[PDB]
Amino acid sequence: VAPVFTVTKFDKQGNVTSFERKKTELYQELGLQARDLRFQHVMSITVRNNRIIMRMEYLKAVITPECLLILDYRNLNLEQWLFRELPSQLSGEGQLVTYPLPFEFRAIEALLQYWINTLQGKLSILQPLILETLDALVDPKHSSVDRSKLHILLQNGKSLSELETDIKIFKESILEILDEEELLEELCVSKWSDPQVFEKSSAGIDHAEEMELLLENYYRLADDLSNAARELRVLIDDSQSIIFINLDSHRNVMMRLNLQLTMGTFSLSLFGLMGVAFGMNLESSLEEDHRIFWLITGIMFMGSGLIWRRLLSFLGRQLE
Amino acid sequence: VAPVFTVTKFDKQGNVTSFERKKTELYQELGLQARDLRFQHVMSITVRNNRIIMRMEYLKAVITPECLLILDYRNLNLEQWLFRELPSQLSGEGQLVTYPLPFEFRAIEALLQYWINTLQGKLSILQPLILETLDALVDPKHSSVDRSKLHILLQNGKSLSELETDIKIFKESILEILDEEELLEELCVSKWSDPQVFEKSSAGIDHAEEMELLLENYYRLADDLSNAARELRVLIDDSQSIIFINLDSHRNVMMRLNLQLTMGTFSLSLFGLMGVAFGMNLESSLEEDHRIFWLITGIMFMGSGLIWRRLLSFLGRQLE
Amino acid sequence: VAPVFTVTKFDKQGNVTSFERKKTELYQELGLQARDLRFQHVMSITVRNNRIIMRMEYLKAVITPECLLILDYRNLNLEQWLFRELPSQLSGEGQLVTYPLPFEFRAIEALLQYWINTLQGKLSILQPLILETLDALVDPKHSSVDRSKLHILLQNGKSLSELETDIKIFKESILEILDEEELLEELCVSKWSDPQVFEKSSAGIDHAEEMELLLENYYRLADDLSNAARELRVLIDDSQSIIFINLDSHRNVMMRLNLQLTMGTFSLSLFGLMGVAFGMNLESSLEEDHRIFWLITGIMFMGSGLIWRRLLSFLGRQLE
Amino acid sequence: VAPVFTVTKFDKQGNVTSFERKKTELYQELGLQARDLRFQHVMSITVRNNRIIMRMEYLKAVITPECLLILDYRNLNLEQWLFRELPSQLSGEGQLVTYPLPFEFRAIEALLQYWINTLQGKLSILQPLILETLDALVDPKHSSVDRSKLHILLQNGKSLSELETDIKIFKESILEILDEEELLEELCVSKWSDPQVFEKSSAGIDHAEEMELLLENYYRLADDLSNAARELRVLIDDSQSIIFINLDSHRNVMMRLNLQLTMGTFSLSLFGLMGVAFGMNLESSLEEDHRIFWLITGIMFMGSGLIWRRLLSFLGRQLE
Amino acid sequence: VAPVFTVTKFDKQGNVTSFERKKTELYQELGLQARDLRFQHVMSITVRNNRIIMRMEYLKAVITPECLLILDYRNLNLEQWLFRELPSQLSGEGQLVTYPLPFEFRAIEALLQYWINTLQGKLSILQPLILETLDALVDPKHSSVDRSKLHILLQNGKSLSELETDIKIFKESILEILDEEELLEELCVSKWSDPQVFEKSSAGIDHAEEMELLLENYYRLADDLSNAARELRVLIDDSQSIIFINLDSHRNVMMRLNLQLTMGTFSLSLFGLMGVAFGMNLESSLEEDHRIFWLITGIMFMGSGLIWRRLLSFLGRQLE
Ligand SMILES: [Cl-]
Ligand SMILES: [Mg+2]
Ligand SMILES: [Mg+2]
């Protein structure tokens, strides 16, 4: 009946243990209040009672000087990352560069690396799709654009805006932590767990400096991602403007050709009316004449041609 | 004759009392000047004479170390919240996380929670409507868009802009309070009411820190709301651009088809003029010939077809 | 020959005296240099030689600890405000809330109140006009918009942009003064006129704090005005986008209907050409037949209808 | 062979001397390095070795406590300003307000006044042209706009953007100098030339304060110029939007009228086809009847009218 | 098997040596960790263990107090710059202005000069192309624009956006270094290599001040580049708006002319229908009359002309 957390616990030795714990039991074990683990804010990093609470959207983590906890990890495709890369990164030959540093450094590096890799993967999925859709859409030899490609571009633009917002909030959180030295000092949970021990254990290694360098690295990576996303948005806008110009130019060409054909039709209809005037079954004084028929036909055709040419010249003058 | 406030008073025990009090009487009771309770600024939080004055649009509140007052609460549908949730939140088993803290913490938490819930409700009402309107409007199989849906989208966009402005001003007020530690210290009215008593009453609990954490929580919630609203605005703009492109593409397709039909009509009218030339009641030298009629009809139809095909090819060349 | 100021002087007792004074004489009386009273900057507030120099566009004022001066007040419709409200506000039962404070507080409050009321009046004039113009323009049942209303909207948008710039510069000046405590202290001219006297005269009343609260009040009012103006601009842009979409949709509907009618005309002209082929005065082998005439007429009409239906179906397929 | 500066030297007495000096000789005389006088940055003000180096685009100046130098003044139309106003401003009855102050104050005031006057002149040239072009272009009674006026507007908009950038960089330089008190102190070259002498020479006059006031004056003037330029840009954008709406409305009106005429033509052609069906030279059973001709003509005309009216009503229903 | 760096080493004497070194060997020689030389961030400047690590996109450099290293220099067309200009700049008569300063000053100046020259070259390539493309596109005498030029403009706009982003990140890095004095002090690697020696070696020359001046120079150059790029973007947007207006105006002119021709055709077809009514082979009572034929023809032509004139007048009234 009581709410519970599905907890994946990684020790300092990289051992992984999955279980479920009551919320009050977790609060008692971690020495934290209920309000600390509400996880109400997406992309939030805080330090409460010497414990690091982190949320990156669906990823909720609690870092202790002794262990790491992942909360609500089910039905999120996190199993591969949790049980394949994390043990190796924390307690193996992974790509982490904070192994000699205390456990919290490795934990923060792993979490930030996973989030930055997720953002990079989203961008690397979105970029080729948007690029090829724009290339198809801005093709100058198409009179009209493909509307299914327009729907695809709209969906990809929505996804790109969401990704850009995620990168922005990640950058904001990292920069807020980096700006204040107090937060950087608080992030060093192992240092403050036993200050007397770490007063001599830290043989010239500044934990705050290492944390600052790690956060600066991840902030720079997120800044590069944000720059790429903004460039993609700008390219999308420019491509949309080019598409508008192409459509307007095609419309103008078709309208000019239709206007020329309308001039031809109007001259043809005028001299056709002139001919039909002689086609009505009313007696005239020109039935007996032999050359009048050919004269009328010739002047009719020649006048149609001349009026069409004059109208074309008038159009050329009007369009300048 | 004198102006009055309709006052809803909540004690430390959660008891609710509704009455009306003269403005001067309220100023005397609260130890505040007339200018303090003007409530001229929407979404303003201030501390005057050890009392917290708050306005969130229509919600005007005065928080004292002993009680809370809601002013001008009538004809605003506030009765349900005032008489159902507030007593439970202040003096019961509500979702407030500041119960062990002094009364002002619970009061501020309740007010900020109500305002943030109002903003979230506005956004959760606006988002599905805007999403479905955009989905209907950006449908690529519609030659023209529904204008009633356009009016609905315009109204919802105005509402979304108003909501975004409200979220922005809420964030600005909260961040202005959070930036300066003096304002955070002033917000702890119970601490400064009896400094001698609270010098020993506060057994290791920092009231300023608790206030900072509460305000940071609500600021983060408002930031998430603002991000969602900005994403909705960006999606609206992108959908409008897609609608423009779709309409232009449909116009281009219809114009091309009309131009092809105009080519057909022009060729038909040209060779029809040629035929009508022989339809006039003028004597010629071809009436006695038998094959001339069928020859003229055949060459007329064939020339119409050939000129139409040539004009279509010319259009294809022009459009590239 | 020498330049002069038309000076309206208000004493501490609210007495008003209008006269003209030579520029050098005014400089000597006020203890100020010529460069101080250039009034080159619109919306500028400064403190020179213990005197407050203020300019709000056409309103130039000099506040002394003993009196207030309005300069160049003629031909600006300022007479009503100068001779009706200002005496009552300074030395009566006006709405000013700084009466117990020294004279400069009342003077600054009156000037800022007049300017904020002018801005509010401009906004309250512009808002209904813009709202009704947009409501008329975004009407979905209009095939075309009213261009006179477009000109009115353009003029009102220019006025709104000017008002927004005025509000922005007012906010900038007030915030620049508020940010630095030195400027706030300098604004208390009565305090620094006789520091020895005011060392004991100020019985617990902080003049700098009162000035800060007054300026914060007026800054918040200006911020609300700026938010309203920005919302109006955003609504104008959204209405323009909606108008564009409505016009494009009407164009598409008219173009589709014209294309259908063009299909009908083309089929009619094709089978009309077929009929005219038999209308020419050339001998054929079908004159004696009786049923051939009705057969040709029937097949002509039926083929016109069938070709029109096929073209309509082709259009439906093309538009998807 | 060696590079040289064309130097115009103004003494403290306003005497002007024009000559040419080798670059190394100028470096030796001014006590400055080669890198100091590169003048690589447009709109840059710096203090090197107690000398003020200023560049405003084409205007390069070096201010010393004893003299002023203008460099590369040829072929820039600077002769009038150099030899007419500068001597009077520096050593006469000019409009400068820093005459009792040391020479560098007058020099800086003259240079900043010239630059601000140049910017004001550019804006006062651009504003009437842009205003009249927009007024001509947004005329609602024009079916189409004048394209030569469009080219003029484009050129003026480019010039306005360049002017706005110049004002922005001028404001940035002035504000960067004003923000740091060290730069303001360094700008007082006469004070630091002989600190022992000026320790008693400055009888209560703060040179840093005077420099701050002068720079604040010029910054406020530049801010007013920037506000005017931004307002002009906003007005240009609004006028462009109004032009777009006007063109779309004219297109819609013309398209509706063309559609009505197309309906008329289609009905006329339908009943004309009906008439032509009886015009073919094929024997029928209605030649002998006398009333059939008039009956057919009457029903033809009446049906044309009725079908045209029905199509117009259908268009009215479709357009809503 | 192990990863290696292709290292180009420049000594203090300008001697160049190209070789390849294992990554671990380079880390040991430079006294740096593996994470220091990841080069994960484009356009990043840092100081680690008294060594300057710089990346400008493809250019990776490590500056030591004794030497400079270029890493991964192959297949980047860097050979000319590496083996022609760098030796002369570092140990010759180059344009560097930091020769008397320690080696790191010359190294930083050379690297920043190369990057700023690359950015200037990119801008000087992009600007004429964009300018000529816009001039061709905004030509008012073209009914339609060239779409190949549109594709060229789109590609150049993408390149310009990339260049603007590069300039922005360069400015951000330089300004981040300049803002904090600690980073400026750290950049002086020779000063901190032997602090005891440089305590007396630096005879009044402040290395931090020289570094600040160099970085300020390069920041100002990058700011000028960014201003030029932003002006180019603004000009591109304005040209696109002008192109839109030109296309709409041409469309309106063509549509008006087509509407006038449609009026003519409609009047011609109406009176042609009137004439054809008399052309059908049905007996009437007007065959014997002689003047009826000419009367009908004359009234037909005159009515066509009059109806066309009336329709033109109606169009003129409608367009206002
Ligand atoms: Cl169009
Ligand atoms: Mg006939
Ligand atoms: Mg359009």
φ/ψ region of C25 (left if φ > 0, alpha if ψ in -120 to 50, else beta) reads: alpha
Q: Is E237 on the interface with D (CB under 8 A)?
A: no
Burial A218-251 (b: 16+ CB within 10 A, else e): bbbbbbbbbbbbbbbbbbbbbbbbbbbbbbbbbb
Type of residue at A165: T
Q: Is E258 on the interface with A (CB under 8 A)?
A: yes
Rounded to a whole number of angstroms, the distance between the first and last alpha carbons of chain A is 82
Q: Is B162 annotated as a binding residue?
A: yes
List the determination method.
cryo-EM
Separation of alpha carbons B42 and B165, rounded Å: 11
Q: Is D77 annotated as a binding residue?
A: no
Question: Cβ distance E96 to E210 under 8 Å?
Answer: no
Tell me whether residue B69 is exposed, middle or buried, using C-beta atoms within 10 angstroms of its C-beta: 0 to 12, 13 to 18, 19 or more.
buried
Q: Is B248 on the interface with C (CB under 8 A)?
A: yes
Distances in Å between the alpha carbon of D112 and those of C41, C126, D230? 16, 38, 21
C-alpha D313 to ligand 1 mean position (Å)? 25
Residues 6+ apart with CB under 8 A from D7: D18, D19, D20, D21, D26, D69, D70, D71
The resolution, in angstroms to one decimal, equals 2.5
C-alpha B276 to ligand 2 mean position (Å)? 9
Closest CA to D27 of D79, D69, D81, D84: D69
Question: Cβ distance A273 to E268 under 8 Å?
Answer: yes
Contacts of E141 in chain D (CB under 8 A): 147
Which chains neighbour E (Cβ–Cβ under 8 Å, 3 or more pairs)? A, D
Contacts of A265 in chain E (CB under 8 A): 265
- D95-254 homologous superfamily: Magnesium transport protein CorA, transmembrane region (1.20.58.340)
B positions 143-182 inside 8 Å of C (CB): 143-145, 147-148, 150-151, 153-154, 157-158, 161-162, 165, 169
Which chains neighbour B (Cβ–Cβ under 8 Å, 3 or more pairs)? A, C
Return the SS3 of D54.
strand
User: Which of E257, E280, E296 faces A259 most closely, judged by CB atoms?
Assistant: E257
Residues 6+ apart with CB under 8 A from C175: C219
Contacts of A40 in chain B (CB under 8 A): 217, 220-221
Type of residue at A62: V
The nearest CA of chain C is from the CA of B164 a distance in Å of 10
Residues 6+ apart with CB under 8 A from C224: B41, B42
Question: Cβ distance C116 to C215 under 8 Å?
Answer: no
Contact flag A259-E258 (C-beta cutoff 8 Å): yes
Closest CA to A144 of B249, E291, D238: B249
Q: Is E283 on the interface with D (CB under 8 A)?
A: yes
Separation of alpha carbons C77 and C72, rounded Å: 12
Which chains neighbour C (Cβ–Cβ under 8 Å, 3 or more pairs)? B, D
Tell me how crowded residue A194 is: count the other CB atoms within 10 A of its CB: 11
Residue matched to tokens 């208000």: C10
CATH number for B1-78 (one of 3.40.50.2300, 3.30.470.10, 2.40.128.330, 2.40.50.100): it is 2.40.128.330
Contacts of C151 in chain D (CB under 8 A): 138, 140, 242
φ/ψ region of E64 (left if φ > 0, alpha if ψ in -120 to 50, else beta) reads: beta
Question: Cβ distance B292 to B286 under 8 Å?
Answer: yes
User: Which of B141, B220, B252 faces A251 most closely, judged by CB atoms?
Assistant: B252
Contact flag A258-B256 (C-beta cutoff 8 Å): no
Taking CA C230 as the corner, what is the angle to CA C226 and CA C233, rounded to the nearest 5 degrees? 140
Contact flag D320-C145 (C-beta cutoff 8 Å): no
C-alpha B250 to ligand 1 mean position (Å)? 11
C-alpha D310 to ligand 1 mean position (Å)? 27
Going through chain A in order, the beta strands assigned E by DSSP cover 4-11, 16-22, 44-48, 51-56, 59-63, 67-71
Which sequence spans correspond to the domains of chain B?
Answer: 1-78, 250-319
Helices (H), chain D: 23-30, 79-80, 86-91, 103-137, 147-179, 181-187, 189-193, 195-201, 207-277, 291-319
Contacts of E301 in chain A (CB under 8 A): 273, 277
Which chains neighbour D (Cβ–Cβ under 8 Å, 3 or more pairs)? C, E
SS3 sequence, chain C? Answer: CCCEEEEEEEECCCCEEEEEEEHHHHHHHHCCCHHHHCCCCCCEEEEECCEEEEEECCEEEEECCCEEEEECCCCCCCHHHHHHHHHHHHHCCCCCCCCCCCHHHHHHHHHHHHHHHHHHHHHHHHHHHHHHHHHHHCCCCCCCCCHHHHHHHHHHHHHHHHHHHHHHHHHHHHHHHHHCHHHHHHHCHHHHHCHHHHHHHCCCCCHHHHHHHHHHHHHHHHHHHHHHHHHHHHHHHHHHHHHHHHHHHHHHHHHHHHHHHHHHHHHHHHHHHHHHHCCCCCCCCCCCCCHHHHHHHHHHHHHHHHHHHHHHHHHHHHHC
Sheet holding B67-71, edge to edge: B16-22, B4-11, B67-71, B59-63, B51-56, B44-48
Q: Is A252 on the interface with E (CB under 8 A)?
A: yes
- Closest ligand relative to E252 C-alpha: 1
Which chain C residue is nearest to residue B282, measuring alpha carbons? C281
Give Cα E95 distance to the centre of its chain: 28
Pairs across A and B, CB distance < 8 A: 157
Separation of alpha carbons A63 and A50, rounded Å: 9
SS3 sequence, A260-305? Answer: HHHHHHHHHHHHHHHHHHCCCCCCCCCCCCCHHHHHHHHHHHHHHH
Q: Is B33 on the interface with A (CB under 8 A)?
A: no
Return the SS3 of B173.
helix
Separation of alpha carbons A99 and C145, rounded Å: 70
The nearest CA of chain C is from the CA of D239 a distance in Å of 7
Closest CA to E230 of E175, E137, E155, E165: E165
Question: Cβ distance E103 to E109 under 8 Å?
Answer: no
Sheet holding C67-71, edge to edge: C16-22, C4-11, C67-71, C59-63, C51-56, C44-48
CATH number for A1-77 (one of 2.70.150.10, 2.40.10.340, 2.40.128.330, 3.10.20.90): it is 2.40.128.330
Q: Is A299 on the interface with B (CB under 8 A)?
A: no
Q: Is A241 on the interface with B (CB under 8 A)?
A: no
Separation of alpha carbons C102 and C190, rounded Å: 7
Contact flag C240-D235 (C-beta cutoff 8 Å): no
Question: Cβ distance B164 to B229 under 8 Å?
Answer: yes
Q: D105, D281, D288, D311: which to substitute to probe chain C, counting the most C Cβ within 10 Å?
A: D281
Contact flag A273-E268 (C-beta cutoff 8 Å): yes
Q: Which CATH architecture has domain E1-84?
A: Beta Barrel (2.40)
C-alpha C248 to ligand 1 mean position (Å)? 7
Q: Is C90 on the interface with B (CB under 8 A)?
A: no
Element (H, E) at A123: helix A103-137
- Closest ligand relative to D275 C-alpha: 2
Contact flag D243-E238 (C-beta cutoff 8 Å): no
Tell me whether residue C93 is exposed, middle or buried, using C-beta atoms within 10 angstroms of its C-beta: 0 to 12, 13 to 18, 19 or more.
exposed
Distances in Å between the alpha carbon of D215 and those of D29, D109, D265, E62? 28, 9, 74, 42
User: Which of C34, C41, C297 faces D220 most closely, judged by CB atoms?
Assistant: C41
Separation of alpha carbons B214 and B211, rounded Å: 5
Contact flag C258-D255 (C-beta cutoff 8 Å): yes
Closest CA to D53 of D27, D79, D77: D27
Q: Is A162 annotated as a binding residue?
A: yes
In the numeric block, which tokens belong to residue E165? 């982003």
Question: Cβ distance E304 to E268 under 8 Å?
Answer: yes
φ/ψ region of A72 (left if φ > 0, alpha if ψ in -120 to 50, else beta) reads: left
- Widest Cα–Cα separation across chain A: 131
Residue matched to tokens 């130039």: C60
C-alpha C276 to ligand 2 mean position (Å)? 9
Burial D7-25 (b: 16+ CB within 10 A, else e): bbbbebebebeeeebeeee
Element (H, E) at B22: strand B16-22
CATH number for D1-93 (one of 3.30.110.60, 1.25.40.10, 3.30.2270.10, 2.40.128.330): it is 2.40.128.330
Separation of alpha carbons A185 and C60, rounded Å: 54
Q: A48, A245, A268: which to substitute to probe chain B, counting the most B Cβ within 10 Å?
A: A268
Tell me whether residue C167 is exposed, middle or buried, using C-beta atoms within 10 angstroms of its C-beta: 0 to 12, 13 to 18, 19 or more.
buried
In the numeric block, which tokens belong to residue A70? 């992942």
Closest CA to A310 of E261, B319, C290, B283: E261
Separation of alpha carbons C299 and E249, rounded Å: 46
The nearest CA of chain A is from the CA of E156 a distance in Å of 11
Which chains neighbour A (Cβ–Cβ under 8 Å, 3 or more pairs)? B, E
Residues 6+ apart with CB under 8 A from B44: B53, B54, B55, B173, C220
Distances in Å between the alpha carbon of C257 and those of A181, C271, D258, D262, D319? 69, 22, 11, 10, 11
The nearest CA of chain E is from the CA of A182 a distance in Å of 18
Question: Cβ distance D281 to E281 under 8 Å?
Answer: yes
Q: Is D58 on the interface with E (CB under 8 A)?
A: no
C-alpha C283 to ligand 2 mean position (Å)? 12
Question: Cβ distance A307 to E314 under 8 Å?
Answer: no
Residue matched to tokens 């959760």: B124
Separation of alpha carbons C214 and B35, rounded Å: 10
Tell me how crowded residue D213 is: count the other CB atoms within 10 A of its CB: 17
Contacts of E284 in chain D (CB under 8 A): 290, 293-294
Contact flag E255-A258 (C-beta cutoff 8 Å): no
Q: B214, B236, B249: which to substitute to probe chain A, counting the most A Cβ within 10 Å?
A: B249
